[PDB]
Structure formats: structure tokens, C-alpha cells
Amino acid sequence: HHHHHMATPHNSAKVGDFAETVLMCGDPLRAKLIADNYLENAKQVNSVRGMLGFTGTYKGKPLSVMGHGMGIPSISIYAEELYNVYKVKTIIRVGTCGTVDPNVHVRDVCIVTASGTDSNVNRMRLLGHDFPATANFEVVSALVESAKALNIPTQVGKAYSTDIFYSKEQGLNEALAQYHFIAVEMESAGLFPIADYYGARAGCICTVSDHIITHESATPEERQTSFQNMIKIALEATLKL
Amino acid sequence: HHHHHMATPHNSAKVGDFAETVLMCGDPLRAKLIADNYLENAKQVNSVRGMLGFTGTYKGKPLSVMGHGMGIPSISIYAEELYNVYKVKTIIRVGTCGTVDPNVHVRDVCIVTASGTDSNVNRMRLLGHDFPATANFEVVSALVESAKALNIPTQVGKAYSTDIFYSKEQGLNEALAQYHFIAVEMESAGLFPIADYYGARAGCICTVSDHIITHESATPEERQTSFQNMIKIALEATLKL
Amino acid sequence: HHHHHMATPHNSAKVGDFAETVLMCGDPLRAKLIADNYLENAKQVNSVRGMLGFTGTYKGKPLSVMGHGMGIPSISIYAEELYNVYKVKTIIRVGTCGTVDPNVHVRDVCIVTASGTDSNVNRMRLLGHDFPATANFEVVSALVESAKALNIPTQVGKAYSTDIFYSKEQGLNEALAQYHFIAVEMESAGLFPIADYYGARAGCICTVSDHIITHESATPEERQTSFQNMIKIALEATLKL
Amino acid sequence: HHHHHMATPHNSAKVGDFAETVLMCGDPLRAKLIADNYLENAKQVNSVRGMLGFTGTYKGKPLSVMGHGMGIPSISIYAEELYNVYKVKTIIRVGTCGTVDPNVHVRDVCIVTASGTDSNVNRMRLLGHDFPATANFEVVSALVESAKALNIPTQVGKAYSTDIFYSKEQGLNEALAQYHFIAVEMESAGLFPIADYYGARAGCICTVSDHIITHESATPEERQTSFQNMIKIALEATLKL
Amino acid sequence: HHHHHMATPHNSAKVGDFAETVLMCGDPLRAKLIADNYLENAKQVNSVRGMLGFTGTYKGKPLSVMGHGMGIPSISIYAEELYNVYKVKTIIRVGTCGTVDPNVHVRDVCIVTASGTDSNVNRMRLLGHDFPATANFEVVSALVESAKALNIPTQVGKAYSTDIFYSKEQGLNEALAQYHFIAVEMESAGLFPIADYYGARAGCICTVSDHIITHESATPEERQTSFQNMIKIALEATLKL
Amino acid sequence: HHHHHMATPHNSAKVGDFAETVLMCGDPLRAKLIADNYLENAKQVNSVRGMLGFTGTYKGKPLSVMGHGMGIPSISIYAEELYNVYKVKTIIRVGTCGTVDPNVHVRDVCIVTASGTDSNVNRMRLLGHDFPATANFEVVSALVESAKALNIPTQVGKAYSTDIFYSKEQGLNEALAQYHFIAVEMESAGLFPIADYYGARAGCICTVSDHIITHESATPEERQTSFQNMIKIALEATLKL
Ligand SMILES: O=c1[nH]cnc2c1ncn2[C@@H]1O[C@H](CO)[C@@H](O)[C@H]1O
Ligand SMILES: O=c1[nH]cnc2c1ncn2[C@@H]1O[C@H](CO)[C@@H](O)[C@H]1O
Ligand SMILES: O=c1[nH]cnc2c1ncn2[C@@H]1O[C@H](CO)[C@@H](O)[C@H]1O
Ligand SMILES: O=c1[nH]cnc2c1ncn2[C@@H]1O[C@H](CO)[C@@H](O)[C@H]1O
Ligand SMILES: O=c1[nH]cnc2c1ncn2[C@@H]1O[C@H](CO)[C@@H](O)[C@H]1O
Ligand SMILES: O=c1[nH]cnc2c1ncn2[C@@H]1O[C@H](CO)[C@@H](O)[C@H]1O
Ligand SMILES: [Cl-]
Ligand SMILES: [Cl-]
Ligand SMILES: [Cl-]
Ligand SMILES: [Cl-]
Ligand SMILES: [Cl-]
Ligand SMILES: [Cl-]
Ligand SMILES: [Cl-]
Ligand SMILES: [Cl-]
Ligand SMILES: [Cl-]
Ligand SMILES: [Cl-]
Ligand SMILES: [Cl-]
Ligand SMILES: [Cl-]
Ligand SMILES: [Cl-]
Ligand SMILES: [Cl-]
Ligand SMILES: [Cl-]
Ligand SMILES: [Cl-]
Ligand SMILES: [Cl-]
Ligand SMILES: [Cl-]
């Protein structure tokens, strides 16, 4: 039939169709790959706007995975709905990033403790002041401990979520490196304050695809291996959450 | 084969695969509907991240149509690439919007002359000052004249592009209405300054899906009819551009 | 007698003494020149603070012309009063400007679609966000069509209204040129949002007196000819409004 | 002859035609009244844009008086030129103001020690920080001592220079009163930093025309008497400067 | 002798007189209490401005303790010097705080993951953007694990470092509670970015003295017991760092 | 006994223990030196946090002296309490400063008319606008006249109160010098608006310890002599207040 129930303007899943724990990545096609290779009992629960989402189990524990699109405004829509309408308790963003830090390398796995931003969305939430987009400590710890159990080294520290992929901003990379921001992406800084609003949990893990300073770049095969390592860390972390 | 050439990180189209004129809408599935119903000579030229794009002709004139995702950061990626890598000259954003204006109604067609925003991306381009995201006059005029020839009434005026769909901002709707902003969406304010940077052209036309104040809402069938009217205006406008 | 009725602190005209359409220029002595050479049935209706204003007819249609002084705060006083107390419907600012754009030349006529600014007055109107000072489309179109009928070429695009004539701001000219701002003046960005507040119309047309980058400068005779061309465009446009 | 030498775009006076000490008021017609009633040896030195200026002597000492128009951008043009081109050393702004302070009354004379503002012009001068627009102490003291010698009571304290005469700003009056701002005007905050830039001196004295809270208002005759008291204080102060 | 060597304007300690790990609290008299009750091998190494500092050992491991005064500017001076001149590697701020969170109680121990602020110091470090003042994960984890081993419950989450103890800011407490800020203090947000600049580590642990909403307040004896619990957690954590 | 009455969280003095006039300096040990050498009838009235305060008489007139610590947040606590709880009428800050002005020299005495800042505390008080931290004119005049009677030359003008002693800010010194800021310190800009809030008086006098540009620096003996000159000016000024 040409029409289905819509719980939100952006998601056709019914309440109850999402697990309490959700992995989100920017690319919905990567969400499908995760579901098709790591979940059992899996069903597709959303395809509105092509933003594929799936619910199943990982090692028997309910888990959903869904795309979030690119940028703070896009993840904010999807995450707000997940926490509010779908009653999700924990979201882990899984993704890729650039780096400027001189001691972070392509293929490294970065576990995000907090994320800076050039967006205004968090100033709007705290009377114009500085509101740190901060990962939940239990989520950070679950990711760190899972990586340790898997013998996968990790970088742990700050990300920077920009609204502008194609930066023209003189001095930005130098400041990010001086203060040891390890990951440049476009979303985490929008996710963490929404989790706070709902009394819920969020974190982020990313693999470095490109070094913005040295120009080093992971090949497609290296990116696949990096994502496999990262996704295994995230999946194992969900068992602790 | 498991790998194709990538002209950008987000688009597998080769240079030359996009026409000089492009319609963009947020929903890639709507881009497909536009291509499948209004273009001839059509081919799919991108599917990276599910962000479908197509190139063909409308009444014999080359025209592309592609999704842009939700929010300023997402459209900025895709539009920057279209102007820079693909040498596009004109982008018309086609979409839906809310309204707060007391004399704008659900199903109305809004032609955007400029768009306000709560994003920082334009302050970053003009030394922290106010940079109006302004549609190109030839594009605005082409849309206005096409609607006149089709006997479709239009509202012509300002939009507001927000980073936050799920607004919690007291007083925003009252200020938007007081100054007669006619459309609330999430993208135009990011598109117009990129067109300026490249010495190129952009505009936006949107149909009102929801009245944010009165709670009126277009049914699915009404939204389809509204989109048909709007897309015909946009398509006819491309013949003048 | 040493005292006359004052409808506002800045204007001795009685309500009804201003036509529904008004041209405003910064120099009150230029307002007098316009009245003395282009209006019939003309009377001086204000001289408070030397800010001369006149009401008569252009080709039989009621039209006023008045000075506005230099800068956003000055035009804001006079325009607020015109719309609020005097019930004016349409104001066209007529003036001179500088340019930094590499393809705009001294003596060019610029029709303003929107104006940026370094003033805070528009942030104050929209909860601290970006509020584009946007000309009314009917006014822009009337100016464009009048110039076409007169065979006078025009540049159509963005202005920048600064609070600081004597700029010391490194990088400003480069950013303005990069984004193709065509006119540098001091007032339009304050006028357009006031028109919006009152549900009324405004626009601006300016002639380039000086190229800020190349140092080219119109002679007094060239400025007179430029103003004659511009004023004829504006006057003819009022017949359409 | 239809053309005269222009030392600046806004002033036809030749260098040397302005005294080292200048009184400026917003209304050029008031500048004429001051010249015609208090100066000897007087000549009109500017009439561009109707912004009348005069040079003569007060009690034998060279003194100029000129209008400055309304608002920070207007006074900034004229004062920048006076200090830079005309080599002026001291400017005293003489004007009218409103008040919100519960212990300041209509007809009071206010001597300004510093002026707040809603303009961005001073942030632009100090890397975005707070730059207090501060009167020169010798000027303040000369005004205070002159008023004492004339037995004229004065209020001494902060002004607030707004870009928006027609305020719509909730809470502004309450904050201004809480911190004992004594005068509301539109110019001093732009004058004092320009004097600083040139290593020169500035101050301001104003008479209260209106109480913004109680709605009390000076009659025309009361405003004349107030201005007479204020101008005598300013004139006597110039003899000390 | 009336004069001693000064390695910095604020500290008479010689380089080498501070251990690589330092506890800092606002009250220098509390620093003395910590040294006199928990350190062996202890000596006073600074008394400039009364800002007492001490170096000794805790369970044999070198450890310093010093006051930092109240507010971001004060801690910034002392911490900058400790990392830069004294080559410190790890600073743990130990202190007291208020809370607004409905589920945080007087006497609770809060381990800070990141701290918001109303200061501009971090915007100045990151081109005007949002720079989250973020604790080092190893420090956070050491505090969490030490509290667990001591069977002391802890709250783990965000602090807010204000410049204004005596807040008059309507809506601040409501926003802080909505986003589950657990601790209100005046310093952590200045410490963490300095540690980042030096490639070093910092964290913060605080005990709740007052509930800002309910008005509950710890008695002097309760504050002593709370501080004893907190200091034992911090001291044990230093053995892991 | 291990516990005393606390009128505030930071001051054990009882109401009435502070005189209506107070000198404050950053270093509490310097407050003690002032009390021990210039006051009679003196008693120590506070030692909480080591922030020594004393009350006695100078030439028979009640006078207190107390430390304020370093930075705007610290002085704000102590001064707010002094005006609010202790009913103080006049505070003179006495301190040291740097200078960048080319005509200000080490050992000079600077009397502050107003102070700029990089803090947000004054924007928070005036709806986000520019609120000049302005000394009371009677206090400034008392300091100026006292220095004259003592034959001590003074510089009179603007200070700049920074949150960051260890500046890394390119261009700051050049802007401060261009606009003739004479003193760089960390506190005055926080004191003056608090005095305004309470309808009370404040000022500041400082001696130049270091020239930030030329690197000149006062020796310890020169700083002692400078402080003696400055404190005598301040003490004599209190007799006029
Ligand atoms: O260098 C980078 N900058 C910004 N985002 C990045 C970068 N590298 C990876 N991403 C991630 O991939 C998308 C953009 O291609 C964004 O969604 C972001 O999450
Ligand atoms: O009320 C509205 N606010 C913001 N965006 C809207 C609204 N109505 C339609 N859109 C449009 O649809 C997407 C969000 O659903 C956004 O991409 C925007 O373009
Ligand atoms: O380059 C320019 N900058 C700013 N304003 C200008 C410029 N050229 C012309 N005007 C116009 O003339 C007055 C100032 O002389 C301003 O009122 C503005 O409208
Ligand atoms: O209440 C007032 N607000 C703002 N400016 C005022 C006020 N009263 C007097 N002026 C003064 O008069 C002009 C405006 O009429 C401005 O130039 C200002 O200097
Ligand atoms: O509610 C509170 N607000 C701000 N700082 C606080 C609060 N409670 C404790 N502190 C802490 O104690 C000092 C101020 O008394 C500050 O140094 C801060 O660290
Ligand atoms: O150059 C300077 N910058 C900032 N503060 C200074 C300077 N010189 C003196 N002080 C003063 O001394 C303390 C810092 O050492 C601050 O409290 C300030 O009042
Ligand atoms: Cl992805
Ligand atoms: Cl589905
Ligand atoms: Cl990049
Ligand atoms: Cl769409
Ligand atoms: Cl494809
Ligand atoms: Cl909404
Ligand atoms: Cl003009
Ligand atoms: Cl008249
Ligand atoms: Cl210029
Ligand atoms: Cl006047
Ligand atoms: Cl003349
Ligand atoms: Cl008003
Ligand atoms: Cl403490
Ligand atoms: Cl010592
Ligand atoms: Cl509080
Ligand atoms: Cl001191
Ligand atoms: Cl005591
Ligand atoms: Cl410094």
C-alpha cells in the first residue's frame, strides 16, 4: 500500500521497533552492512529518506543500527526521535574522522570523551555559554575496556564536530593540534547534549581515514579493516551497557 | 566490481555527469521520483551514502536532480562539490517547509528571496558580520514568472534555515512572524553563500507542509499535489536559466 | 511663530503630508534637488534638523522625497516614523556606494537584493541569529524593469551596510569581493527589517562613486550623470508600486 | 561657481578652518544657533549635506561648532575627519538625552564619564573584547569645574549610546537603571575611541529632555533654558582646554 | 633575608621543588591541612601571596599540594606555571561545589568528566568556537576506580565553572539541571585546556556543599567528612598516575 | 574554638567590622603590610582562605584594607560581599600593572578612569551589550588631587582587566597601545559594575611594574618605592571620600 504509519516525520518504525541500545553511523548503507554481518534476528525498521535502520540482536542482546546522515542538524533529528519517541537509552556513534594531531595516525581508533564544535546548537541550550558536548563515562569506559579485551590500541580524547567539511578557516588546524583534538568529524557535538536532555547515554568511536596535515590516507581495504576493528569494539561495548 | 572511481568523498559521478543546472531536494527518494517522472535521457549518476542523483533532460535541456540530506552541513558538502568539481552553474533547492506567518497557509508555494539562520557558517565567511544568504535574482524571477505562466499563486519572501528541527526556543516563532518570514526549513541559508563563492547561481522554492502556529497540516495527497505544482514551476524555471 | 506641531521628535510634517511612496537619500540637499527637478505639486513638509523632506507628484502619482542622514541609526529613526506615523507603504533608498567587486565599475547602477552589515540591529530583532536585510521582490523587480525600459544597464545583488565609513578592517574587502557584494554603503541593512516589521515594502538603488580596490573615482560630472540615470529608474519604478 | 574644494567627502572646510577645540551637537541648526549667539569672529566653514559648521572665538579663544547628525556612524565620520584631517585636539559633544535613572530628572545636566553601547564598533577595535568608550579626564574635570563656577548642579556618570532610538528591547531600561546609567543618547560611545586613536581628547555633556520611565518631558521653553545652561558650561570648559 | 629567588611572579619554588603530580584546592589553608595530615617527607615550597604549596610523598610516591585561589584567572596562573616552569605532568583539582541536579545531594562526591563555563578563555583558544574543557580519561578512571576500592559512591559527569559566584542569572539553574550538570564551581574549565596545551593531564573531584535548589547545606562536620572521603579518593588515584 | 561565625562563605568578619571605605589589593600579605604601617586602632577582621583583612583608622578616619586575590571572579566575590553584607560605600583598588603604552614607564602611577576586559561578566549585566566598567568620578578626582598635593606625577586613563595573565593573543598589545590603554591588570573591570549595582563608589590606582613591550622591569626596591607613593595617594584620597 502507498502509505504506512509514521511515528515521526523521518521514521516509519513503530515504538518498540528500536532496541534500547543503538549504533548510528552517517552512511545508511554502512548501517545495512553492519546489520547484515553482525546482527541476528534482524529486520529493517526504517527506510524513510533512505535512512536505513535495523533492529536485531548482537550475541543475543537487543541492538539497533541506523544511519544518521551528515552533520549536526541531521543527527539531531534522528537522535532526538530515538530518545524521545523510541525510548532508546544508549546511542554509540560509529564513524570515520580526520585528524590533525601529530601523534594520531591513519587507521587509529579514537574513543571520544567530548567534542568541540563551530555550531551554535549548544550555546542555544545553555544561555549562550559554553556547554561541553560530553560522552557518558560508562559508554567511554565500555569502549575502552572492549578494545583492551580485543587487543586493539585506541586513542582516547577530544573530537571536533564541524558544520563545514570543506574548511577555508586559517589557523583552525593549528589550534586543534595545539590542544590535542584527536578526531575531526561532524556529528558527536550534537548527539551528546540530546542524550543529556533525555537523561540518557551516548558516546562515539571513530577510525581515522585521513591525516589532514600529512595528507596520509587509508586505502579502501585499510578503511574496511579499520571499520571491522572499530565495529567489533562498539558491538562488544553494547554488551556492557 | 567492489570499487568505483570517486571524484569526491561523497559522489561517484565523473566530471561531466552533472548538467549545468541542478534541482536538489532533501530526500533522495524524492530525487528519484522527480527523475523517473519528469526527465528524459535519464541515468543515475550517484548512489554514495544513498544520496541518489540523476542526470537527463527536461524538455530537451540538460538537467540533474539529486538529494541533499537534511541540514546546512549536508547541503554544503553536496553543493560545494557540484559547483567546484562538477562545474554546475545553477542550483534550485526544491523542498518542503513549515510556516509561522499568519497569512501563509498549508499548500502554499514559497519562492525564497533570502534565508536567515541560526548557523554560524555565514558569520565565518564574513569576518563575524551579517552575511545575508541571498537568492540570485534571475533564479527568483524565473521561478516567479514560471508560476505566473502556470497560474499557480506564490508567496515570495524570506525563509529561515534552522539547525534544530525540534525547536525549544521561546520567542522564535513570534519574531519570525513579526518580520514576515514565510518559510521555515534547514538548508537554503547554507546554499546561497556557496553559490556566491563560485560566482554561480542558486535559489529555493518550497511548499508549506505544516503551519507551526495553527497546527494545520497537509495530508499526504495534498503534499503530493503541492509538490507537483512546485516541481513544475522549478522545471519550467530551468528553461530560463 | 517660534513653534510648530511635531508629529515626531524629528519631523514636523502632519500625518497625511507624506505620500504612500517615498524616495530617501542620505543628503537632504539632494532630496531638495530631486524635488525641485522631478516633482510637481511639490511642497516642503519637513526641515527639522535640516533633514529636508518634500511631497508632490511624479507623472501625477503622489511621491515624497526626504533625506535620511548617514548610517543605520539615522535611517532607522526616519524610516520607522514614515512607516508607523505617516503610514507610508513603500520606501526606495536612492544613494551612492563604493564597490570592491572586480567586475563592478564606477558609474554602475546597483539594484540591491539584500544587504549585509556589521551592525547589531538585526541580531537584536531575531534572538541573536542571522536576519537577512532583504529587499521586497516587487520593488526590486520594478527597479529592474524600469532600468530595462530606459536601456540603462544594472548590477543586481548584495550590498554591505557598514557602521564605519573609515574602515581599518583587514580582510574585509577581500571577503566582500570573494562573495560578490556589489555595493558598500551605510543604510540599507537598517531599512529593510523596519519595512518587514510594518508589513511594508522597501528597496535600494545606488550608483558606484568609487572603486575601493582600483581607486577609480567618478568625477563630479560623472556622479551627476550617474545620479540622473539612477533617479529616473527609481522614479519610473514608483509608478509600478 | 558650482564646485568647491573638498578636503573630505563630507566637509568643504580647508585644513586650518577648524579650531583645535570643537563643540559638536547632533542638530546642525543648533550648531548655527550656538555660533550666532556665543561666538565672535565667526564664519561658516562647512555646509556639505546641510551639516553646518562654524569657526570663531569664545571669549577670544578659537572655537568651532558643528553638527554631527544622529547615531554612531554619523558622528564617527565627522569626528574621524576633524581629528585626522583638521588636526583638532578636543571635541566636546553637547546634546540632549533621555534618562531611566530614578534620581535623574528632566532638565538635569549630565556630564558623561563613559558610555555603553549596543554598537559593534568598539568590539571591532579591540579584538572583540570590551573597550570602554571613556571620556578624557581633563575634559570631564573642566566641565565639572565650569558648572561649579556657574552654580549649575550636574549629574556625573555613565551614558548609553544606542543604535536604536525606537527601542523594543524588553529589560533594557531596567538594567540601565539598576547600574545607574544617567543618560541615553546615540553618539558618545562612538566619539571617545576615535579621540583615543588620535591621541586626542573628547567628552560629552547632555541635558535630560525626557524621563523614559516616568514619562516626564521638558517643554520647549524648558529645553531652551536647559540648553543655555549646558552650553555655557561647555563654552567655559573650552577655556580650560 | 628580605628577598628570595622567584621562578615565576607568583611562586618562589625552584624548578624541581614540585612533584610531577599535584593536587590543587582553592583554599591554601586547606592545602596546608592536606600536607600536614596526608604527606610524608613534606616541605613548604611556596608562600607568595599566601598561596601555600607543599611537596612530599603519599605512600612513598612524590606528590605536591597547593592552593589555586578562586576563579578561572587565578587557577590559570598557577596551573600554567606548574605545567610550564615546574614540569608537572598531572594536576587533580580537589574542591567543593554546589549542585542543581535533582538527583545529586549534599555530601555527594562528584568526579568531573568535562566542565562548561561562562568565561571566554576557551573561545579565545579555539578561534571563537566551542572548546570543551575535558578531563583526561586516565585521571577520571583513576578517581572512579579509587572510589570503588574505597566503597565510596560517586556521581560522574559535567561541572559548570562560573566567573560569578553571586549569580543573578534567570534560567541558568533550570538549564544546568535540564542537562544534568552535577557540580557548580569556578575553576575546572580553566584547568583542563591548559593541561591540553602542555600535553599533560588534569581532572577534578569535588564534594557537594550546598544544593542550590533545595537549599540543603552540609554542616561543618559533614563538610569535613566529605572532604576526608574525597581527599582519600584523590590521593589513592595519584598512585595510579 | 574550632568554629567561628561566618557572615559570608568567604569572610568571618561581623557586619560593622569593616569601615565604609576600603582599600583592596590582590596580595593579602600586602594588605597586612599596609595595615601594619599606615593604620592605627587596627585589628584583623578576616583570615578565611588566607585572605587577610584589617580595619583601623588612617589619620583618625575609619579605613579597612583587605586582599582580593587575582582575577575578576575573585574580586567579584569579595567586593559583592563588602558592598552588600558589610555596607561599604567606597572601595579603592590598589595594585600593580603592566603597560604597553609607549609613553608610560615602569614606576609610573596610573589612576584608572575605566577598564576594558576580555571577561563576559559585564555583557551578562547589560543584555549582552557593552557596559563600560567606569570608576566613580569623585574617587578619580580624590586620587588625582591627592597625588597633586603630594607632588607625585600620575597617568590618568583606561586600564584593561584580563582573565589571562599568560597571554598568547596576537595583536592584543598593538590594539591596547593604539588606543592608549595605560594599565594591564586583572580586576578593575569586575569591581566597578558591582559598585554601580549597589549605588556605591569604586576606583583604582596602580603602579607599573613591567613594560610589556620594552621589557623594562622595576627592581624589588623600585616596586617598594612605587607602592609607597601609590599607597600614600590612596590613603590621602580616602580622607576626601
Ligand atoms: O576530515 C573530516 N572532516 C569532517 N568530517 C569527516 C572527516 N573525515 C570523516 N568525516 C566524517 O565523514 C563525513 C564527511 O565525509 C561526516 O559525516 C563525518 O562524520
Ligand atoms: O517546520 C520545519 N522545520 C524545519 N525544516 C522543515 C520544516 N518543514 C519542513 N522542513 C524540511 O524538511 C526537513 C525536515 O523534516 C528539512 O530538510 C527541511 O528542508
Ligand atoms: O565606500 C563607501 N562606504 C560607505 N558608505 C558609502 C561609500 N560610498 C558611498 N557611501 C554612501 O555615502 C555616505 C558616506 O559618504 C553613506 O551615507 C553611504 O550611503
Ligand atoms: O531617549 C533618547 N534616546 C536616544 N537618543 C536620544 C534620546 N533623547 C535624546 N537623544 C538624542 O537626540 C537624538 C534623538 O532624538 C540623538 O542624536 C541623541 O543624541
Ligand atoms: O555554588 C557554588 N558556586 C561556585 N563556586 C562554588 C560553589 N560551591 C563551592 N564553590 C567553590 O568554592 C569557591 C566559592 O566559594 C570556588 O572556588 C569554587 O571552587
Ligand atoms: O602585566 C600584567 N598583567 C596582568 N595582571 C598584572 C600585570 N602586572 C600586574 N598585574 C597584577 O598582578 C597580578 C598578576 O601578577 C594581577 O592580580 C594584577 O592585578
Ligand atoms: Cl558511516
Ligand atoms: Cl521499512
Ligand atoms: Cl577539511
Ligand atoms: Cl524532499
Ligand atoms: Cl551509480
Ligand atoms: Cl518546529
Ligand atoms: Cl545622497
Ligand atoms: Cl517645513
Ligand atoms: Cl572605506
Ligand atoms: Cl542638538
Ligand atoms: Cl560653506
Ligand atoms: Cl526609547
Ligand atoms: Cl578548598
Ligand atoms: Cl616558602
Ligand atoms: Cl549561586
Ligand atoms: Cl597587591
Ligand atoms: Cl580573624
Ligand atoms: Cl602578559
Residue D206 placed within a domain? yes
CA distance C19 to C12: 15
Tell me the C-alpha distance between F39 and F30, whole Å: 13
Contacts of F118 in chain E (CB under 8 A): 120, 124
* Contact (Cβ atoms closer than 8 angstroms) between residue E28 and residue E50: yes
Looking at the DSSP bridge assignments, the partners of residue A112 are A157
Domain assignment of residue E125, yes or no: yes
The residues facing D94 across adjacent strands are D205
Residue contact B196–C179, C-beta within 8 A: yes
A144: which chain E residues are within 8 Å (Cβ-Cβ)? 137, 141
Domain count, chain C: 1
CA atoms of F142 and B62, how far apart (whole Å): 80
Using CA atoms, how far apart are residues F213 and F222, in angstroms rounded to an integer? Answer: 19
C-alpha distance from A161 to closest chain E C-alpha (Å)? 10
Q: Which ligand is nearest to the CA of E30?
A: 19
Report helix angle F72-84 to E72-84, nearest 10.
150
Query: From CA E114, how far away is CA E126, in angstroms rounded?
Result: 17
Nearest CA in chain C to B177: C197
Measured by CA distance, the residue closest to atom 8 of ligand 5 is: E97
Nearest CA to ligand 1 atom 9: A97
Q: What's the CA angle centered on F208, arms F202 and F210, to 5 degrees? A: 140
For residue A145, how many other CB atoms are within 10 A of its CB?
Answer: 15
For ligand 2, say whether the CB of B117 is within 6 Å of any of its atoms.
Answer: no
Report the length, in residues, of chain E.
Answer: 241
Residues forming a β-bridge with F61: F58
Residues contacting residue C161 through CB under 8 Å, at least 6 positions apart: C72, C115, C116, C117, C119, C133, C185, C186, C187, C188, C189, C190
Question: What distances in angstroms separate CA E79 from CA A139, A157, E72, E184, E188, one per listed residue?
Answer: 30, 20, 10, 20, 11
In 3-state terms, what secondary structure has residue B65? strand
CA D92 to chain centre: 5
Under an 8 A CB cutoff, do D134 and F122 touch?
no
With beta carbons under 8 A apart, name residues in chain F contacting E29. Answer: 49-50
- Helix, strand or coil, per DSSP, at residue A221: helix
- Give the three cell numbers for residue B127: 569576518
Q: How far apart are CA E94 and CA E112, in angstroms?
A: 10
CA dihedral over F224, F226, F227, F231, signed as positive or negative: positive
Pairing of strands C109-117, D61-67: unpaired
Query: Could you give the CA distance from residue B83 to residue B73 in angstroms, rounded to a whole number?
Result: 16
Kindly determine whether residue F80 and residue E186, on different chains, have CB atoms separated by under 8 Å: no
Measured CA to CA, the distance from residue C110 to residue A27 in angstroms comes to 45
The cell 545495512 sits on which residue?
A32
Q: What is the DSSP letter of A48?
A: G
Query: CB contacts < 8 Å between E and F, how many?
Result: 102
User: Residue C41: which region, alpha, beta or left (left: phi > 0; alpha: psi -120 to 50)?
Assistant: left
Please report whether residue E129 resides in a domain: yes
Cα-only R_g, chain D: 17
Identity (one letter) of the amino acid at D209?
S
How far are the Cα atoms of B172, E43, E143, E239 from residue E40, in angstroms, in the given order? 60, 9, 22, 15
Short-list F231, F180, F169, CA closest to F36: F231
Q: Looking at residue D156, which CATH number applies to its domain?
A: 3.40.50.1580
Task: Give the integer Cα–Cα distance in Å for F211 and F213.
Answer: 6
Give the SS3 label for residue C25.
strand
Number of helical (H) and strand (E) elements in chain D, helices listed first? 6, 10
Cβ(C104) – ligand 3 distance below 6 Å:
no
Question: Looking up cell 540599507, which residue turns up?
Answer: C188
Extract the C-alpha cell encoding D50: 546641510
Cβ burial of D178 (10 Å; 0-12, 13-18, 19+) is middle
Which of F80, F84, F122, F126 to probe the D interface (max D CBs under 10 A)?
A: F126
Written as one string, the DSSP assignment of C80-117 is HHHHHTS---EEEEEEEEEE--TT--TT-EEEEEEEEE
Measure the CA–CA gap between F85 and B103, rounded to whole angstroms: 56
Distances, alpha carbon B17 to alpha carbons A150, B74, D106, in Å: 45, 21, 73
The residue to which cell 557518558 is assigned: A136
Instruction: Determine, yes or no, domain membership for F10.
Output: no
Q: Which amino acid is at C141?
A: S
Report the C-alpha gap between F74 and F186 in whole angstroms.
10
Q: What is the CB neighbour count within 10 angstroms for residue B174?
A: 12
Contacts 24+ apart (CB under 8 A), A209-213: A209/A96, A209/A97, A209/A98, A209/A106, A210/A98, A210/A99, A210/A106, A211/A98, A211/A99, A211/A100, A211/A104, A211/A105, A211/A106, A212/A98, A212/A99, A212/A100, A212/A173, A212/A184, A213/A100, A213/A102, A213/A173, A213/A177
Can you tell me the distance from the alpha carbon of F57 to that of F54, in angstroms, rounded to the nearest whole number? 10
In whole angstroms, what separates CA A66 from the centre of its chain?
Answer: 10
Contact criterion met (CB below 8 Å) for D92 and D139: yes
DSSP class of residue A131 equals -
- Closest Cα to residue D28, out of C70, E56, B79? C70
Instruction: Return the partners of chain D (3 or more C-beta pairs < 8 Å).
Output: C, F
Q: Strand runs (DSSP E) across E84-236, as ranges?
A: 90-99, 109-117, 133-134, 155-161, 183-185, 201-211
SS3 (DSSP) at F98: strand
Does residue C15 lie in a domain region?
no
> What is the C-alpha separation between A200 and A25, in angstroms, rounded?
19
Residue E5 lies in a domain: no
What the block records as the C-alpha cell of C217 is: 573615482
**How many other β-carbons are positioned within 10 Å of the β-carbon of residue E86?**
23
Could you tell me if A195 and A80 are in contact, meaning their C-beta atoms sit under 8 angstroms apart? no
Which residues have C-beta within 8 Å of that of residue E120, sequence separation ≥ 6?
F118, F119, F120, F163
Query: Does the active-site annotation cover C118?
Result: no
> Ligand 13 mean position to B138 CA, how many Å?
28
Domain that holds residue E171: 21-238
Distance CA B187, CA A73 (A): 10
Give the torsion through C-alpha atoms of F114, F115, F119, F123, to 10 deg: 20
Q: Which of C33, C136, C39, C128 has the alpha carbon at shortest distance from C83? A: C136
Q: How far apart are CA E56 and CA E62, in angstroms?
A: 6
Which residues is F53 bridged to in the sheet?
F46, F66
Place of cell 542569572: E169
CB E116 within 8 A of CB A125: no
Resolution (A): 1.2
What is the bridge-based pairing of β-strands E40-46 and D201-211? unpaired
**Cell of residue E137, nine digits:** 580519561
The residue of chain F nearest to residue D125, with distances taken between CA atoms, is F175
Contacting residues of D for C74, CB less than 8 Å apart:
69-71, 73-74
For residue B39, give the C-alpha cell: 526527465
Q: How far apart are the first and last CA of chain E?
A: 38
CA E162, CA E116: separation in Å to the nearest integer? 8
- Closest-CA residue to E185 (of E92, E107, E118): E118
